[PDB]
Design a protein around this nucleic acid. Sequence first.
RNA 1: UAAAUUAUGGUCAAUUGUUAGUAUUCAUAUUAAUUUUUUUAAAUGUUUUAUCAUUUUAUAAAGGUUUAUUUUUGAAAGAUUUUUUGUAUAAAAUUUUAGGAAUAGUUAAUAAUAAUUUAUAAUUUUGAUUAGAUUGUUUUGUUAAUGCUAUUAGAUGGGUGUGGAAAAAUAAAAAAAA
Lengths: 226, 143, 151, 213, 34, 41, 51, 255, 267
Amino acid sequence: PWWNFQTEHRQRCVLMYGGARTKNTHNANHRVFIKKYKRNAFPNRTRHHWAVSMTGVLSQRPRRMPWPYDLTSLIFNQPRQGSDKIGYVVGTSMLKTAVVATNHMVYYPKFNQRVSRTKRFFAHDEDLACVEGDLVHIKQCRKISKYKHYYVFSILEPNVEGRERLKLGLKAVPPPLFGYPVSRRIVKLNLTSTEGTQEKLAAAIQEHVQDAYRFSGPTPDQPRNR
Amino acid sequence: LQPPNLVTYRQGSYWKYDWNAGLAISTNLADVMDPRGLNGCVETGRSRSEVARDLGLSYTRPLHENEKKQLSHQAVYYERLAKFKMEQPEAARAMERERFVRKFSGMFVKMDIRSGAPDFPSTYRRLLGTKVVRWASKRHGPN
Amino acid sequence: NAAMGLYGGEPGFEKAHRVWVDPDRPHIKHIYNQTALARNLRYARYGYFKRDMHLLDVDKLVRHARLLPTPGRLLTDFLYQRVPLPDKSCAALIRYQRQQIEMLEVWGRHASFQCAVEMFERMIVTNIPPVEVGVETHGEMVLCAAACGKW
Amino acid sequence: GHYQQEAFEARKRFEESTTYPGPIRAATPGDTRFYSGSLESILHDTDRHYWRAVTDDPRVQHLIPLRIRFKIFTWVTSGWEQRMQVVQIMAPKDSTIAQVKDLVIVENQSPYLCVSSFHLAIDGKELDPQKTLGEYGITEQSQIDAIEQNDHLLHRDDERPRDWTVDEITAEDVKRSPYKEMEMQPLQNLAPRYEARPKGYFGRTYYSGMKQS
Amino acid sequence: IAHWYCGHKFRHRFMRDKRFHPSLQASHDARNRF
Amino acid sequence: GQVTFGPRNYPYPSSRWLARRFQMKKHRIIKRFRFRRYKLA
Amino acid sequence: FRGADTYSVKYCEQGRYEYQRYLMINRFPSEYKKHFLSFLSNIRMSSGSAT
Amino acid sequence: ERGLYFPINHRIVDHRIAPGVTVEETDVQSRYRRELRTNFATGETRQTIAPPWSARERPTHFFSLRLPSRNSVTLRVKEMHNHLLFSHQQCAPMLVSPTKLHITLGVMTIPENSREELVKNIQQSMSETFACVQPLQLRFRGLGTFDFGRVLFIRVVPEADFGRLERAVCDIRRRVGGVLGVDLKGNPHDSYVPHVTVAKIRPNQRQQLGDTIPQSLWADYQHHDFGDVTLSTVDLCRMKGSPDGYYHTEGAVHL
Amino acid sequence: TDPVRRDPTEFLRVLRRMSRTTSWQKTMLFASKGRMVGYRLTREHYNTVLFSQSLWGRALEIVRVVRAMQEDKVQPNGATYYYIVNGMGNADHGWNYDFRINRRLEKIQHWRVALEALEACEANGFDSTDTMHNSALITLVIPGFNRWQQASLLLQRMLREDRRMHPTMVKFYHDCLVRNNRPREASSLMRLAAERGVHGYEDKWEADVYKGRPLDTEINSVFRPRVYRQLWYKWQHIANRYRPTAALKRRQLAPRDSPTGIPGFYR
RNA sequence: UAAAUUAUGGUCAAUUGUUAGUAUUCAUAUUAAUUUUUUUAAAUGUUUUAUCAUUUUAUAAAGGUUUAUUUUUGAAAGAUUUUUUGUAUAAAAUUUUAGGAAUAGUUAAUAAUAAUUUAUAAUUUUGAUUAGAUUGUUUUGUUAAUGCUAUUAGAUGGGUGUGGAAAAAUAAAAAAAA
Ligand SMILES: [Mg+2]
Ligand SMILES: [Mg+2]
């Protein structure tokens, strides 16, 4: 009897008349986090875990749920969830493939609004028709490779500019001038001459050994005296 | 009109400007190319390439040197193998023996669900650290 | 991160050490990048290279830099910093001026050629620091004169 | 039985018919490569992965899947057992027996099957390597086997492969072709694992098509 | 708001929630938020 | 720390008394770091 | 009170199967062929000797 | 160990065999990839299917797009022939002469007994249907195979003027095979695929030149670009090129 | 760099601390960078580096630092030979999923390096302990490659020198013998171990069956040095030192939603 | 850019803590739960047969997984009989950490190829990969309520691979061929 009070509970074996017999899982448990690492010495290098981290895939707060009511489902009568996807082909470097960026939708009930999340897929195509920029429609099919389970069904928009550039021999799209950063620290352009290459190398190695010395910790207020 | 950055371009947002500007799909496709072979049959489910091959059309983009070389190398495979097996059966038979014994001496000769898993490290992650050592990353592709 | 350190936590072994790239022979793809904590585009312009002007390739700096000043003021900065100028440095300055000569029109490059000859006069009157006016520099100057048509 | 004869009669009358402008290529579609399920299943040339409720016009088959049955002496733990293997080749409609032999020896892809010269035979009757399938009337349902050079004396123990269970294998014999693949030395990992069946799997007698009890 | 989640002060929990806000979600206009 | 801790709609950037407690901490930190820098130099 | 009096009287006036609307359930062509073949086989025979 | 334990390319199940005989009775062993090689890779192009009655008698006449000898495709295929002859000298009889190149739009068999009245109707229909179409431009690139590799032709990708060309050829088929009875190899409601034949094995040459053209001869040029050619004439011709050293002229329309 | 960190005594002390409480990568990188920029490295520095290298049991780094010492013309003591032979003996090796842990050992040829290190340590006049010889024999016989003749010669040398035999090298040599099909040598090793009294082979004694004739992937195991699972060993014995076969697991030493302390349990 | 009605219909939304100049949800209430007054074991021989054997008996806690766990009718149900018809390993979305950077027997094409083929490969700042935490998308608690706060048991590698299916090494509230 969940609706009955604590003192009103004469027994707990069955529900006498009807309702919902639910286990009273104790939410108020006062879970404790035990600090097992130094403040600046957490084993992970990117994300630090300093408190109780909430666990769950869909039960987390704020609530996030899939939204099947999007453009793809409005256009297509999908036999299976996510069977058909419309997206732009971005990246054509693997033979008989076409990488397509299609965006799904996730809904937040708490804020009562939706946002779009972009996901990339590998779409198989024959005769190499998919050129960069085409608005394509892809559908699920049999597994083709380790990461290929979509295939293009129709090229809604042909990239005329890309095809003409390919005919002229140039790339379908100029490569972007900005990419992923290789390292967090900034990359400084090297312009030293041949004579100064060794000096620049010495300076760089000195900087690296200083960064290694930083592992030691704070320098003592009193210099070491024996 | 060079793409701003690779991080944004990979997610297909460079071409999303055409979608956002209202010019997403406006090209007069019939004039630039035949639209009969650029779609797919819903009843059969065959793709645009299948429709093109059924109608005798070929919508092939201009190709660079490397893809043409790949296509030629893959095409020459059967012609090379047919003559090689006849002319020099010694090495072919040795390789066949090695493969025949390799199929016996391997991992999961039975085609169960574990072996059939296309992405073994991604599917079985809980044993990737303590049980197996062959893979170091739990995922290798977009999925 | 596998090469240095096991998991991290030890200070000085989380972030990769400083990486230097030769733009003429790049060892990375897309050297410039955009990130909240990895903005390196601003660190590839003129002004950061004054610290190491004593040992650098002026030709490479001309080839790849941002907000590069005029060649006359660049030479003035070099002289004021008293960095010795070898033959290839002088040739690089002259070809940097010639790549503006070419940009200017055929009939409108007389003023720029006069600027170039004034720069050459300053170079030959530089005295200290030692400026090496060499055969390559003379060839670059003759090429600029040919471009200007002042036979 | 009935299907083959009725298909032949229908094809004959279709050929004899003269008032036919020809099938529409656009209206008649081909088989698709993409479909549900993670298996690539090939069907007959007249079957499609999609539902096709209309019976299409019959066509002359330009590619017959000839299936040749080879003897194979697989190594079971109890002993050597002789069983059957099928090698399938795609030969044109008028392929001579010479090119059929070329196709079978190029598509056998087994180390033991094509060890020596062999002749193709049907129901025990040898096939002349000069005429084509048209003379023999060979269809896709024809049962064709092959007879090797030394399969007429395989009943002899000397011709039979020698198992280590009953026969002694020498230091020169372990260096031979099949006995190198087989491993008489039990390795820790036991790399050559083979099919095993008990000696009493078939009872006191071996496998037979009749009853002996 | 459970006290063990995120930091001791509640503004830690609120800042942690703000990274999942739909209006501030990572996109072309708002990228590299952290 | 939070120098501008003034109440809601405070017509001034901060409080003079509150600012001194932050200036003292800043001065002490700077002085100790400068002295240690001089010693290690 | 979950009693019948709480439910609307209009629940009792409806005809049989009028509550269900029209559904448009489409499937892959391969699934359509599989289902058609299975239904044809079941129509031809559904059990060994109990059909 | 190199990759997946069971590659996707090797998970092939054959439905041509009986269901219960593959598990126990026998094991089928074959290379199933060859028959599933796609038409794009193997160069096969689906030609219009001819009925059995029309597939027996040999053709008599054919429509073609007459082109000047100076056209770009002629010298492109000339250089292709030079490369082929330099690489292998045995494919010269298979290779056709550069002066016998035309873009075929349809093939038919006019009986010789009643050819005179049919050719006039055919030529007048061609004139009346081409009195309005402007000269066409076609971009040729790629290689294809007909008659199981017997005929090697240059593919015609869709491009500008190709839609007009296919509409015109459909109208020609309607006006020639539809209203008046002439044996078209295909169907009047079907559209013939234009092509120019670069290599072909004659039935008499089938005795010693093999059964098909090996793919290695044209593998490198399977996707070669032969460029854009403008056509402004049409000709109904007959298979007679040897006597005059040129295409036989039976009907012509200056489009 | 400030003079306090520029002082080479600070370099030595920080390098020693790094070797005491870090991985091999830290010490190797720091020492290499310091040698590159100033910081004249001495025999003490080289021995400190070799300490961590041997602790982590790596061969390529050890041969690199040995080549560096040869270039710098520093005369080493017996500690260097002990460290290099122990590193060779502690080099990782394992057949997991038909895939060896280290494919570089075959190219490195660490057995020859261990043998020459032992020979040089004996020749130059330094003490030779049992551990160096046992490590050398371990390098000689492993599941990777078969080197039994040289191992037998080394075992005869140990027998005539009255040196102790370690159970790890005894087990490795026995496995190598049974894999190379030398039951006579396996029986001799079993007799020697039984006579000595090794913990593993105290009871295992067998009679001599070769009494009338005179003389003339496979293994699936993983071996790594102690330092890899020293933390696991320490916490296992701290938690349950009265039930050794307990399989120390989660929640035995840390409550829910709290770190267990050791990063990378069971690798 | 018109009003309503042939009149409450179609079935209950409702907030309670005696403070302490003002700013800001933060001491003490109520409900739910833990805590004292001693409530509260998980059983030891499964069975039949043609006898040194064979036949029937398939997911308990062990190992820490956030782009992740997915498959059969070949046994059985199962029937005059023979015979026959079909599958299925694949997906899509939701995925944690105060101070956030690189990851890897690796992507695609080819094939029952390649420890040694071909290619301008693939993952990731739209937050990846390692590391920490936690058995994933019908379970509670509180409130008038978009919230906040909980939940469980079980899929942790192969290596003669039996079986329809490995889930196969103590652990019942499963009657298992009279
Ligand atoms: Mg607490
Ligand atoms: Mg984990």
